[PDB]
Each structure stands twice: as C-alpha cells, then as structure tokens.
Write a protein that binds this ligand. Structure first.
Ligand SMILES: CCCCCCCCCCCCCCCCCC(=O)OC[C@H](COP(=O)(O)OCCN)OC(=O)CCCCCCCCCCCCCCCCC
Ligand SMILES: CCCCCCCCCCCCCCCCCC(=O)OC[C@H](COP(=O)(O)OCCN)OC(=O)CCCCCCCCCCCCCCCCC
Ligand SMILES: CCCCCCCCCCCCCCCCCCCC(=O)O[C@H](COC(=O)CCCCCCCCCCCCCC)COP(=O)(O)OCCN
Ligand SMILES: CCCCCCCCCCCCCCCCCCCC(=O)O[C@H](COC(=O)CCCCCCCCCCCCCC)COP(=O)(O)OCCN
Ligand SMILES: CCCCCCCCCCCCCCCCCCCC(=O)O[C@H](COC(=O)CCCCCCCCCCCCCC)COP(=O)(O)OCCN
Ligand SMILES: CCCCCCCCCCCCCCCCCCCC(=O)O[C@H](COC(=O)CCCCCCCCCCCCCC)COP(=O)(O)OCCN
Ligand SMILES: CCCCCCCCCCCCCCCCCCCC(=O)O[C@H](COC(=O)CCCCCCCCCCCCCC)COP(=O)(O)OCCN
Ligand SMILES: CCCCCCCCCCCCCCCCCCCC(=O)O[C@H](COC(=O)CCCCCCCCCCCCCC)COP(=O)(O)OCCN
Ligand SMILES: CCCCCCCCCCCCCCCCCCCC(=O)O[C@H](COC(=O)CCCCCCCCCCCCCC)COP(=O)(O)OCCN
Ligand SMILES: CCCCCCCCCCCCCCCCCCCC(=O)O[C@H](COC(=O)CCCCCCCCCCCCCC)COP(=O)(O)OCCN
Ligand SMILES: CC(C)CCC[C@@H](C)[C@H]1CC[C@H]2[C@@H]3CC=C4C[C@@H](O)CC[C@]4(C)[C@H]3CC[C@]12C
Ligand SMILES: CC(C)CCC[C@@H](C)[C@H]1CC[C@H]2[C@@H]3CC=C4C[C@@H](O)CC[C@]4(C)[C@H]3CC[C@]12C
Ligand SMILES: CC(C)CCC[C@@H](C)[C@H]1CC[C@H]2[C@@H]3CC=C4C[C@@H](O)CC[C@]4(C)[C@H]3CC[C@]12C
Ligand SMILES: CC(C)CCC[C@@H](C)[C@H]1CC[C@H]2[C@@H]3CC=C4C[C@@H](O)CC[C@]4(C)[C@H]3CC[C@]12C
Lengths: 341, 341, 341, 341
C-alpha cells in the first residue's frame, strides 16, 4: 500500500537510526544538514521507485503488444514476453525515437536504484573513514572542556571561601579531515548533478517512445506465414516514470544549492561556542578558532553541533545571556548554579 | 482489511511515538494541540488512501474499456492497459470534461500522499530546528525552579527550627523561537488551505469525467481495419475518490480554525503557572511573563505544558488552591508536605 | 520490492553484524578494508540475483515457446515446461550458439550464488581459524600496554610528589597467522579473478543464445503427426542477466586491486602506534615493530585498528601531537590529564 | 528469493546458535570441527531442497502430460494430476527405466529431508546424552585449575614478600564418553556414505527417466473411446534435481575424510595445554594426559578447545612463550602480571 511506503520512507526514522553501539551514544558525527541532505537524496528515489509500482497505480504488466485475434492466449503471452526481452536486441524492434529510449524505459527502476546507492556511498565513506577520528577527538575535547569549567568553578569557590587549547591549536594546521569532508560533499554534488542531467533528459523524451514496433521473426518463425510481420507494443507505466522523474529532478535541483552551501565550511562557523567559555577567566580568553580551510573549522562545526550535550556549556551560556542582559556577577552566579555534576 | 488500517492509523499511537532516546524522556517539545493537529492533518489522507483501495471496496482493476466481442482476452487486456497509459497522451483520448480530470483521477492517491508529506514537513522542521533549543532551555528552567522551591522550603524550615528570573527576562527580548513557531504554523495553514481548494475542486468534478473515449490507433494500428475507431473506457473507483475527497475536505476545513487559533501565542498564555511560584516568598513575586510576541510567550506555553512533571509545582499548586480556600498557612503546610524529593 | 532489497543489502548492516557474544565486544579481528571487501564481494552478487527477478522487471515465466494456435492452453504449457527441462538434454534441442550457453542462461542465479558462497568461505575460515588467537593475544597486549602507561604515570607522579615487549619480540619470529591471512587474501583474489573471467565470458555471449529450437518428439510423440517438428523458444530475462553480469564484472575488476593491495601487509604498516608509547620513558623507546613478513606485521595492523579503544593511547597521542607543536612538558601534562581510569 | 535462502542457511548463524540458557554460557561442548561438519552435512541438503524449488528456477508444475487438443482445460488438468498420482501405481504407467526412477523423481525432496534429519540425529544424541556430563566435569576442572594457579601465585608472592590431577587420572581409565563420541562419529560417517551412494545412483539415472507414458484407463474410463490410450508425461525439475544431487554428492564425499579424521581422537591430542600449567611448580610437573583410547583423550580435546576462556591459561601461556624466548623469570613476571581476577 502507498501509506505503508509513506510511513517507512518519510515518517519512520529511515536512515535516521542512531548508532546501535556503546561507542557512539549521543554523539552526532554528522552535521544535521548533511544528514537530512543524505536522507533526502537517498530515500527519495527509493520512495519514487516504490511508488511507480504501487498496486494502486500499476494496472498489471509493464508491456502489452496486441497480437491478432487468431492468436491463442499463450501465443499472445509469448509475443508480450518476446518483445519485452527484445527491447534490447536492436536488430528486431524498430522505434521512431530509437533503442536507447526503450532501454531507459525498461531499466528506469534500476537506474534510480543505482543513483540511490551512488548517493549513499560518500556518507558511508565518511562514516567509516573519518567518523571515529573526530568522534574520539571531540569526545576528549568535551571532557577537557568540562574539566576546565570544573577547575574554574573550584578556583572561584576557593577565592570565595590548557592542553585542549594546544590541541585545537595544532588541529588548525593539519587539513586531512577537511579535505575528506569536502571530498564527500563534492562527490555528492557531482552525483546529484549527473542525476539531474539524466532525469531532465529522460523526462524530456517524446512521451511516445513507449510505443515501439516489435517483430517475432527470428529463428524458425522467419519462414512462418501465419504470424504478422510486426506487433504494436506499448510500454505501460512510462508516463508514471516520467512524472516521478520530473519530481525527483525538481527535488534534486532544490537540494544541490544546499550541498554547494555546505561546501563552505569556514563561512558556516558562526555563533562561536568558544566565546561562552572565553567568558570564563581560567581558560584562554580567545576564540582562537576561525578563518581557515583546516580541520579546526570542521571541529568548530562539530562542536557547535554536539555542544548542547555538556551541561557546563548550558550553564555558561545562560550566564553569558544574563551578562548580555547585565544583572548579576559571574563567579557569584556560578557558585549559585551548583551544576558540577 | 479495513479494521487493520483503523487500528494502525487511529487506535495505535501513530505519530504519537515519544522520542526513543535518553535525551528527551518525558519532555513534550510540541504542544498537545499542535501534535493532534499534525497527527490528524497527516494521518487522515493516509487513512483515506488506504481505504480507497481496501479489498472490501475495490472491485478489481482501476479501469475497464469494453473491447468488442471479437477481441481475444489478451487484446482486451491490451486495450485496457493502453488506455490506462494513454490518459496522459492528450492526442489520442478525447473526453468531454478534458484531460486534466483524467490526470487527477489517475494520480489521486499520489496527490493525497503529496499533501500528507507537505503537511508533515513543518512539524519535522520544528522538531529538528527549534526543538533542542527549547528542550535544553526549559529543562534548565525547571531545574532552577525546583531548586528555588527547595531553597524557599529550607529557608522557611530554618525560620521554623534569581537567575532563572533573569533568564526569562532576557528571553522576553529575543524572538527567534516565536517566528520559527508561527512560521511552521502559517506554513501548515497555507498547505491546508491549498489542500481544501484542490479537494473542493476535485469533488466538484462532473462525476462523469471518469468515462472517456480512448483510441488505439497510433503506430502500425492506424492502418489496421479490424480494430474499432474508439473504445469506451471508465475509470473505476472515482466515486470512492470523490467521497473520500469530500470527507478530507470537511475535516481540513474544520482543522483550519484550530490552526489559525494556535497562531495567536500571546492570547493562549493563560492560567499563569508563574503565579503559583509567585505565591512563594523567595522567588520574585511577579508573573513577569505575558503580553508580547516574543520567545517569552512560547516558553510560557511550553512551561504550562510540561509543568506537571515537577512535583514542586504540584505541591505549590495544591497549596495555592487551599489558599484560595483559605484554611491554613503557607510555610507550616509546606513543612508538613515534606516533598523535597 | 526493489527498495526492500536495497535496504536489506546496502543500508542495513548486512554482514556488518558485530559478534553477538560477550567474548568479542568492541574488538575488530577483521581489518575494515577486508571487511568492506568481503561485504561487497559477497552481497553484490546476492543483490544482483534478487534484482534479476524483482517483480518490477520480471514479466513472468523464464521461457516461452510459441506453440501453434491449434494447441490448447495446457499443450502450450506442456511445450514450455518440456523445453525448459530440455535445455539440458542435448539430443533434442538444437541452438546456433550451442548447449552450454543455454545451460548458463538457465543456471545463472545458481552460478552467482555459488560465487557468493565461495567468496564468503575464506572470511569464514579466518574468523573460525585465526580470529580467537589474535583476539586473545591483542587483548592481553592492550591490557599490558595500558598497565605500562599507568605504571609510567605513577612513576612520574611519585617523582613529582616489559613483558609485552618480549611478547611482540617473539611474535616477530613465528609466521603462522600471516601465512593464514595471506592465504585467505590470495584465495579471495583467485575466486574473484575466476568470477571476472566467467562473467566476462557470459556477458560476451551472442545475445541471441537465449533463442533456441526445441522439439517434443521423444517417446510416443515421435510418431504423433499433429505436433510440429520443432518450437521456437526464447529464454526471457537473459538480457537482464547479461546486464547485471557486466555490472558485477565492473565491480569485481575494481575490487581486485584492493585485494592485491591488502596482500602486502608490511607496506601497510604505517602511522606507527608504537611511537606514541615510545615517547613515554618507562616502556622501551623503540618501535621494534616493522619490516618483516611475520605475525608481528599482522599484529601491528590489528593494533593500529583496535588502538583507539584504549584511552591511554588517546591521551598519549594528543600529548604527542602537542609535542609536535611543542608547548608544554610530558610528565606535567600527563599528571594534569588524570585519565588513569 | 534465492538470496533469502542464502542468508538464512549460510550467512546467518543457522545451527550455530549458542545454548540460550544460563547453564551453558561460553562453554563449547562440541568441537568446532564437529560443529562445522554437522552444520554442513545438515544445512546443505536443506539449502539444495530450497533451491530446487526457488521461484527463479521452477517454471511451474512438477509434471505435464500433453493431453490431446480436443481435451478441455479441466480434462488436461485431470490427466496431469492423475499421472502425478499414478507414478506410484505400477499397473498403469509404463516407462523404459522403470518405476523406481519415477518414485525417486517424485520424492527427491523427501529423501533429501530424510538424509538431513538422519545426519542431525547423532549430534542431537550427543548434545542430550553426553554433553551435560562433560560440561559439568570440565567446568569443575577449569575451576580447580584456575584455583591451582592462584595458589601457585600466592605461594610465589609469599616467598617473595592436586585433586584435579587425580580426577584426570581416574578419567584415564573409564571410556564411556569416548565410545559415545566415536559412536556418533561412526554413525554420521555411515549415514554420509549411504547418502553419497544414493546420490551417486540418482545422478547416474538415464536423464530421460523423467519422461514416462501414463494411461488413464482404470475404472469406467476403460470403456471410454474418446480418451487416447496413453499420454506422454514429463517430470519437470528432474535435471535440477540431478544437478543439486551431484553437488551434494561432491560436498559429502569431501566431508567424509574430515569425519574419518575426527574418528581418531588420540592422534588429534596435540599442542598440550597441560604443559603450560606444568611449567608452574605447584601443580604436578607432568602432562599425564595422552596416548589412550579413553575419556582422558576426549577431555584433552575439550580442554584444548575451551581453554582460552580462563585468563590464568592466557597469562601462563604468554609466560611460556617468553620462556621459549628466554628473557626474564617465571615468579617475578607472574607477580608483575597481577591477573588473579
Ligand atoms: C582524498 C580522499 C578522497 C576520498 C574519496 C572517497 C569517495 C567515496 C569512496 C567510497 C568507497 C566505498 C566505501 C568504502 C568505505 C571504507 C573505506 C575505508 O575505511 O578504507 C580503509 C582502508 C584501510 O587500508 P589499510 O591498508 O588498512 O591502511 C590503513 C591502516 N593501516 O583505506 C584504504 O586506503 C584502503 C582502500 C584503498 C587501497 C588502495 C587501492 C588502490 C591500489
Ligand atoms: C595453510 C592453511 C591454509 C588454509 C586455507 C583455508 C581456506 C578456506 C577453507 C574453508 C573451509 C570451510 C570453513 C571451515 C571453518 C572451520 C575450520 C576450523 O576451525 O577447523 C578446525 C579444525 C580442528 O581440527 P582438530 O582435529 O580439532 O584439531 C585441532 C584441535 N586439537 O582444523 C582441522 O584441521 C580440521 C579440518 C581438517 C582435518 C583434516 C582433513 C584432511 C584429512
Ligand atoms: C546512468 C545513466 C545511463 C544512461 C546513459 C548511457 C549512455 C549511452 C550513450 C550511448 C547510446 C548508444 O549507444 O546509442 C544507442 C544504443 O544504446 C544502448 O543500447 C545502450 C544502453 C544504455 C544503457 C542504459 C541501461 C541502464 C542500466 C543501469 C542499471 C544499473 C543497475 C544498478 C544496480 C543507439 O540507439 P539509438 O537511440 O541511437 O537508435 C536510433 C538511431 N540513433
Ligand atoms: C513544478 C515542476 C513542473 C514541471 C512541469 C514542466 C514540464 C511541462 C510540460 C508540459 C506539461 C504537461 O502536462 O505535459 C507533460 C508534462 O506534465 C508533467 O509531467 C507535469 C506534472 C507536474 C509534476 C510536478 C508536481 C510536483 C512537483 C514537486 C513536488 C514536491 C509533457 O510530458 P513530457 O515531458 O514527456 O513531454 C515533453 C513536452 N515537450
Ligand atoms: C497539487 C495539485 C495539482 C493540480 C493542479 C495542477 C495545475 C494544472 C493547471 C493547468 C492545467 C492544464 O495544463 O490544462 C490541461 C493539461 O493538464 C495536464 O495535463 C497537466 C496535469 C496536471 C498535473 C497533475 C498530476 C498530479 C501529480 C502529482 C504527484 C505527486 C507525487 C508526490 C509523491 C489541459 O486539458 P483540458 O482539461 O484543458 O482539456 C480540455 C480543454 N480545456
Ligand atoms: C457533511 C458533508 C456533506 C457533503 C455533501 C455536499 C455535496 C452534495 C452533492 C449532492 C449530494 C449527492 O449525494 O450527490 C453527490 C454528492 O454525494 C456525496 O458525495 C455525499 C456523501 C457524504 C459524505 C460525507 C459523510 C461524512 C462527512 C464527515 C465524516 C467525518 C454529487 O457528486 P459530485 O460532487 O461528483 O457532483 C457534483 C454535484 N453538482
Ligand atoms: C562456475 C562456472 C561454470 C562454467 C564453466 C563450466 C565448464 C564447461 C566446459 C565444457 C563445456 C562442454 O562440455 O561443452 C558443452 C557441454 O556443456 C555442458 O552441457 C556442461 C554444462 C556446464 C555446467 C554449468 C552449470 C552450472 C551449475 C552450477 C550450479 C552451482 C550451484 C551452487 C549452489 C557442449 O555444448 P556446445 O556449446 O559445445 O555445443 C555446440 C558444439 N560445440
Ligand atoms: C561501464 C561498463 C560498460 C560496459 C559496456 C561494454 C559493452 C559494450 C557493448 C555494446 C553496448 C550495448 O549497448 O550493447 C550491449 C551491451 O550493453 C550493455 O549491456 C551496456 C549496459 C551498461 C551497464 C553498466 C552500467 C553500470 C556500470 C557500473 C555500475 C556501478 C551488447 O550486448 P552483449 O554484450 O550481449 O553483445 C556483445 C557485443 N558484441
Ligand atoms: C533412502 C533411499 C531409498 C532408495 C532405495 C530404496 C530401495 C528400493 C529397492 C527395491 C526396488 C523395487 O522394489 O523395485 C521397483 C519397485 O520400487 C518401488 O516402487 C519402491 C519405491 C522405493 C522407495 C523410495 C521412496 C522414498 C520415500 C522416502 C521418504 C522419506 C520421508 C522422510 C521425512 C520395481 O520397479 P523397476 O524399476 O524394477 O521396474 C522395471 C523392471 N525392473
Ligand atoms: C565437479 C563435479 C563434476 C560432476 C560432473 C560429472 C558428470 C559428467 C557427466 C557429463 C557432463 C554433462 O554435462 O552431462 C550431464 C552431467 O552434467 C552435470 O550435471 C554437470 C554439472 C556440474 C555441477 C558441479 C558444479 C559445482 C560442484 C561443486 C560446487 C561446490 C549428464 O547428466 P546425467 O548424469 O543425468 O547423465 C549420465 C551420463 N552418462
Ligand atoms: C542541473 C540542471 C542544469 C538540470 C537541467 C536539466 C537539463 C540537464 C536537461 C533539460 C532539457 C535537456 C535537453 C532536452 C533535449 C535534448 C536534445 C537531445 O538531442 C540531446 C539532449 C538534450 C540537449 C537534453 C540535454 C539535457 C537537458 C538540457
Ligand atoms: C477553504 C474553503 C474556502 C474551501 C471551499 C471550497 C472551494 C475552494 C471550491 C468549492 C467549489 C469550487 C469551484 C467549483 C467549480 C469551479 C468552476 C471551474 O470552471 C473553475 C473552478 C471552480 C470555480 C471551483 C473553484 C474551487 C471551489 C470554489
Ligand atoms: C580480470 C579481467 C582480465 C577480465 C576481463 C574479461 C575476460 C576474462 C573476457 C572478456 C572477453 C572474453 C572472451 C570473449 C570471447 C571468447 C571467444 C570464445 O570462443 C572463447 C572465450 C573468449 C576468448 C572469451 C574469454 C574471456 C574474455 C577474454
Ligand atoms: C562414497 C563414494 C564411493 C561414492 C561414489 C558413487 C557410487 C556410490 C556410485 C557412482 C556410480 C554408481 C553406479 C552407476 C550405475 C549402476 C548400474 C545399476 O544397474 C546398479 C547400480 C550402479 C552399479 C551404481 C551404483 C552406485 C555407483 C557406483
């Protein structure tokens, strides 16, 4: 049923399943925008494949050939199957548009599936090539940051009663993780553009290319006289193919700008999470994280993503908000917070 | 079976599944009215799609064409499939109402599915764009509020034997979360109005537009003489489509007032949860939360929603009720409550 | 449906299931490259088998024979089944290409399944022959290494306030595990090359070998006169077979270089994990692990794989990174880390 | 689908399910070679049964009889069913090869299933007759051995700062468990040889025995004149049967050497696990476990299997390896290990 496909591919957490493993529990490792881009670009062609052959649209066979009335039931079935298999043998069939349109009409689901798999590949490469590195690294970074906050709080309390910095500093120099990331991003963009090109071509077919003339006159039937010289076959479910093709095209051409936007990692580094902790006196009072096509920018983005997980950041951020309001004091309100654990 | 669809889409918690994650356990993040509006507006077209093709209403094919008696079984099947695919090719078929009614009759399930997906989109954008922010924020707010209550109770006990305020204060100024919310609300309203327009048009079709004249005379069949000039086809299951369309129309036009009501967030801020804690002496004796198209109003609504979760509010609220009755005393009954944990 | 096969064989963790047992929890025992090579080489022919007979491509029967019109329905069915079973009996059928092409056309799915099983065998032999040995050994090695790190940290702290080496040393001499590994690697390579050869041959068939002349004239039918001398049969779904064959061929010929690369275990030993711990003063300041076709190289690779699991390595590695930056000091920053447990 | 059968019977842990019970958690009770032999010998005929009737090979019915054209559809169906049921009644049908080939062709799946069950029986008898005894016994043995190791370690530590032997000794005399084991081994061998004999006979059939002449002339039809004297039936799916039969034959004749090898339990007792603990001074310095067709040999094999489970053995074995290298000292390195628990 259509509604089951709808649930499975839109309303269920399809490709939204968190890593079912104790290694990555609560950590993102994939920016939400990239995750939704991948989910769309992959699940949409699958959904359209499943829709093109839903029992509510498909009338039956994918082809019909209109054998003469003198033919039996089984001779008609033979003609149908023969021409279905003969869309490939270019010697027999003769269509106005050519053999390539028929090739495409027969294998449209396979092509959409190929595009889905190709679009799924770069995210898989990212999840299995650069995900564990950044996972471990930002895990250590959050641990060290929370520890720095606890140290600042203990120092302020004692007054009342920087290795992670060097790590981010050295990360600013290497650029392995960022070229991997922009490589996957560029790969997805290229595959999406090729898919839009193919879909725009396919949707642009003569809309009568699904009608082709087929002839069962190979082998011993060539001398047979009771068979007509040619049969008028028609590839059913081609209009549905072109419609879903134009839909996929319109969606992918809307998606491509999002991808080419995600391509610019330095421009996206905004709402500096480093400033909140910079308000604290103990840690270095410096953002020290911006303006560079290097892994530092990538870690900035992933920190801005996974930063709500540490309570230390939540308290420091609400305190920063009140500082923008300017009501109380930093160490007094920090001691009043009492959120070490 | 119909009853299985009934269970799945009405009696099961379809789209009522709580977030299966330790991050959001017991927190709402979606007002109950918005949740039910989304569940209705999305699951209803899905349910009607599943009903239109239930095995108990559908007689069989979606089309039948009444080929002459001299035709074989397979020639008749070919005519049926050809005309089914030829509802799109406007050159062949000639109907009184036009080709657009037939287009709509064939793709009615796809259109209902498109409307379901479009109506599901804004809630998804809300759940993935503004949900974590408000989640963390109101979580911190409830923690600070419960802590304020424990502090007031300890102070009253010692007599016997305000950062969250500034947070709500600064929230009153920014308006990001409220424009996001009213944007999703307005989006759902626009999509619902477009759906009602389309359904009112579709249901208003001539009810004979499902009968169209089709002609298999393209290709080599144009010279064929044993074929009749045209066939009388009829799109079965169109009356069912129009009936379910009028049902969906009547439901969506009842739903739209609820949406346009939810559009007014300040008017909905009622039964001030802040007053209960204002009865307490320690916390600021002021509502300080009303009368503004800002995130403060949004947080008021979400607090009024998720406020039954904190026991501190339950005790203070029953105490406020007794105060409205006027029997005992506030600190004495608070010490007699003994509900710190 | 095609999309279900897609999910099951690409998007689900097919052959990516971790060992569901408390013996191996978090340990790899299979290099990621070998794991993906096996998953591809095995699941791809299965996916193509499932695709070749998807309800969206398959028109129906796998064969049709075009009996004369005077034949009944059941006589036609008999002719079809007879010729289907008679692709093997070489005395009856006479095809231009020969009987071997028809043999292959009938049993193509069985051959692809055989190749899948054969490619799955060497990984199974590795997982059940050499996996527990290396599991226990590298488990002990990581335990001893973490213990060495804790000892160095305690020594540095006391200043403030080598059996695993011999094990790796003796492992450098034996070469059982490495010949097992390169034997499985060479086995997979040979099977892949044979599969590419067979697929290149099959895809290179005349594309009309699916049409063969069959004759039901054995037994009592030899004297029957109302039967024609021969029937023109055609093996449907052969073009699909050749297409998926060319796809599998193109994928396997891309895979073979990866395998022959994995064949060189010493060349792959890079990014020495031993150097990080060599920076520590307590443990032996020497890599002592390289340049040899022996089990030592294999353990180096498996350590480089499973080394992110021990936190001790994470701390020492970030410290080594800062040392490459050159900001602080080793024992002071180690005491400041405080990551013993 | 074929790929589902592939997953279920090869890639899933079919007959590899560990005992889902707290009594046997982590204990083997079945040597890995015997386990794989049983899994192959049982699951292979099941897999071939499931393959012989996969929807991708089976054309339809298992028989077709070619009734005359004057027959109706239902008369033809009657002829088919009659001859299918009449392969047993030897009075009616007359085939060149005889009635036994047809008997075999009809009941080939049942025979393969019978062989699968018969091969599964001896492992079941072992698992339910001698498994608990050896389970409890080797459990106690490992407990006593680990305890002996802890005692030796405590003695060495005190210097720094034998009932299990008698049990194995008395086990050397009784021979119940070993005759049970070799009885199951011999049973599996005999069943495998009988299966190879039957399969070699079946595959050696004339390949035209699937064509037989059937006659519906019993009862009132004997006087009927409009029925022909005999019908030419053909058992479809017999070539597939013979092919899968030759496959099963080739696999079983490869398996039989493995079984007859497993028959020699004393020869298999190698890589003495007793020597590792013999290196320890406390326990008896003697293997005292070899050279006898008695339960002692069986316990040696099961200990060599389940010996990696005790950490005590792992430490003593790595220490023995270093002793073969000759670097340090036994008690000092044992105290440095610190692996009592
Ligand atoms: C600038 C980078 C651009 C990257 C673009 C990527 C685009 C998407 C490609 C998707 C391909 C399918 C999905 C692959 C997922 C798994 C990839 C992976 O993790 O590969 C790891 C592999 C490890 O190789 P290994 O010899 O073990 O060396 C490292 C350890 N010492 O790493 C390897 O290098 C092994 C595989 C290649 C071997 C050489 C092949 C040519 C010879
Ligand atoms: C240089 C090595 C090259 C290896 C290439 C391997 C290629 C892939 C082969 C795949 C075969 C199918 C999958 C087999 C998986 C299980 C294999 C396994 O673990 O075998 C263990 C078996 C143990 O034999 P056992 O008598 O118990 O002796 C050891 C304990 N004392 O070990 C055995 O030796 C038993 C089986 C063989 C017995 C002798 C047969 C000939 C006589
Ligand atoms: C990806 C998208 C692929 C589409 C583009 C393919 C490039 C084809 C360009 C060459 C075309 C060609 O050879 O010309 C036709 C032959 O095509 C052919 O007959 C070649 C067939 C094209 C292959 C398409 C089949 C898709 C299979 C993909 C399945 C993947 C499965 C993944 C799981 C001739 O004919 P004509 O039209 O010129 O005749 C009228 C006279 N000009
Ligand atoms: C918005 C996207 C609109 C795309 C439509 C542009 C093509 C117009 C072509 C004529 C319109 C029409 O009805 O005729 C067919 C297209 O119909 C169609 O196929 C139009 C159906 C509209 C489908 C889009 C609805 C959902 C879009 C996004 C959903 C989310 C032609 O057919 P042809 O292209 O074969 O002939 C090639 C023509 N020279
Ligand atoms: C969303 C609701 C969409 C319905 C409204 C579409 C706007 C169509 C307006 C233009 C109509 C048009 O082009 O006129 C007809 C051609 O329509 C056509 O042939 C165009 C076909 C309209 C597209 C509707 C197909 C729905 C596909 C949506 C699937 C989405 C899938 C999502 C998973 C001509 O004919 P005539 O009647 O004038 O002839 C008698 C003479 N006047
Ligand atoms: C309450 C909503 C009532 C809607 C009915 C208004 C339309 C009346 C049109 C005539 C009545 C009738 O039986 O004829 C068909 C409508 O029937 C129908 O389709 C009426 C069936 C009533 C269905 C509503 C029942 C449940 C409503 C909510 C459930 C929750 C006409 O058919 P047409 O519209 O094609 O011809 C266009 C006519 N000029
Ligand atoms: C693995 C790939 C196997 C393909 C290669 C097999 C080698 C065959 C080489 C000999 C060929 C042969 O005997 O010649 C033909 C007979 O073949 C035959 O009739 C022999 C049939 C070949 C066996 C292929 C069947 C595959 C079964 C595998 C299933 C595995 C299942 C696993 C679960 C004669 O004919 P002609 O063409 O010369 O006549 C025209 C005159 N020259
Ligand atoms: C990239 C791989 C391209 C492989 C194509 C090379 C063969 C060209 C042969 C002519 C092209 C054509 O359309 O005719 C058939 C091949 O089509 C085909 O079968 C071409 C379809 C292309 C399929 C590859 C698309 C996905 C590749 C990887 C996906 C990941 C011939 O048919 P024949 O080979 O029987 O006749 C033997 C010819 N003398
Ligand atoms: C296990 C493998 C069993 C196969 C070997 C059975 C031994 C049969 C030896 C005697 C044969 C016999 O009686 O001769 C034929 C009658 O056979 C018959 O009619 C007897 C039928 C043989 C029984 C095979 C049926 C298998 C059932 C197993 C199902 C198990 C299910 C488990 C869940 C006569 O005929 P002819 O050929 O001599 O005529 C031409 C003239 N010589
Ligand atoms: C390796 C095992 C090879 C077994 C083949 C030996 C029998 C040869 C007989 C002639 C070859 C042939 O194609 O004709 C049929 C056998 O084909 C076949 O049935 C040969 C197909 C080969 C199947 C083996 C492929 C996988 C083996 C292991 C996979 C793991 C004869 O048929 P018949 O035996 O009824 O006539 C009895 C003949 N006088
Ligand atoms: C990503 C954006 C640019 C996609 C837009 C759709 C593009 C790729 C489509 C739309 C119309 C298409 C064209 C329509 C018709 C023809 C004529 C034919 O003889 C060659 C291909 C050609 C020239 C097509 C090329 C691809 C095309 C230009
Ligand atoms: C949300 C509320 C307002 C929905 C009410 C249903 C509306 C949208 C429906 C009900 C009747 C419909 C009309 C019925 C008939 C026609 C004539 C046709 O030639 C053009 C469309 C037009 C003019 C329709 C437009 C849409 C319509 C006005
Ligand atoms: C791994 C790489 C090398 C695989 C490349 C495909 C190879 C194996 C394929 C491609 C074309 C094939 C050839 C095509 C045609 C013929 C003629 C025939 O009478 C004998 C086999 C022979 C000679 C084939 C042998 C195998 C072949 C050479
Ligand atoms: C385990 C090994 C030995 C199995 C080898 C296959 C054996 C059992 C097969 C292969 C060929 C077979 C023979 C083929 C033909 C005949 C002639 C027939 O009138 C009696 C049975 C007899 C004599 C068969 C007996 C079984 C047989 C010898």
């Amino acid at each position: 049923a259509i509604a089951q496909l709808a649930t499975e591919y839109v309303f269920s957490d399809f490709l939204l399943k968190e890593p079912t493993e104790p290694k990555f529990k609560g950590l993102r490792l994939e920016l939400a925008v990239d995750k939704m881009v991948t989910c769309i670009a992959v699940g949409l062609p699958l959904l359209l494949i499943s829709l093109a052959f839903a029992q509510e649209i498909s009338i039956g066979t994918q082809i019909s050939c209109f054998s003469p009335s003198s033919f039996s039931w089984r001779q008609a079935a033979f003609v149908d199957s023969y021409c279905w298999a003969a869309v490939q043998q270019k010697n027999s069939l003769q269509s106005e548009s050519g053999n390539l349109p028929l090739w495409l009409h027969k294998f449209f689901p396979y092509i959409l599936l190929l595009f889905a798999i190709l679009l799924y590949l770069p995210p898989l490469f990212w999840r299995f090539a650069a995900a564990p590195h950044i996972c471990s690294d930002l895990k250590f970074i959050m641990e060290e940051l929370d520890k720095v906050y606890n140290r600042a709080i203990k120092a302020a309390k004692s007054a009342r009663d920087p290795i992670v910095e060097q790590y981010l500093k050295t990360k600013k120099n290497s650029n392995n993780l960022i070229i991997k990331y922009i490589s996957c991003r560029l790969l997805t963009l290229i595959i999406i553009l090729l898919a839009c090109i193919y879909l725009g071509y396919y949707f642009s077919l003569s809309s009568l290319s699904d009608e082709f003339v087929c002839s069962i006159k190979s082998g011993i039937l060539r001398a047979d006289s009771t068979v007509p010289d040619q049969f008028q076959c028609k590839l059913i479910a081609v209009g549905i193919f072109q419609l879903l093709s134009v839909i996929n095209l319109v969606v992918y051409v809307l998606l491509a700008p999002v991808v080419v936007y995600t391509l610019f990692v330095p421009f996206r580094q905004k709402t500096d999470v480093l400033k909140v902790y910079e308000i604290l006196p103990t840690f270095d009072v410096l953002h020290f994280k911006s303006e560079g096509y290097n892994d530092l920018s990538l870690y900035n983005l992933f920190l801005e993503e996974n930063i709500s997980e540490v309570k230390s950041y939540k308290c420091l951020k609400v305190l920063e908000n009140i500082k923008s309001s300017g009501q109380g004091i930093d160490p007094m309100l920090l001691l009043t917070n009492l959120g070490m654990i």
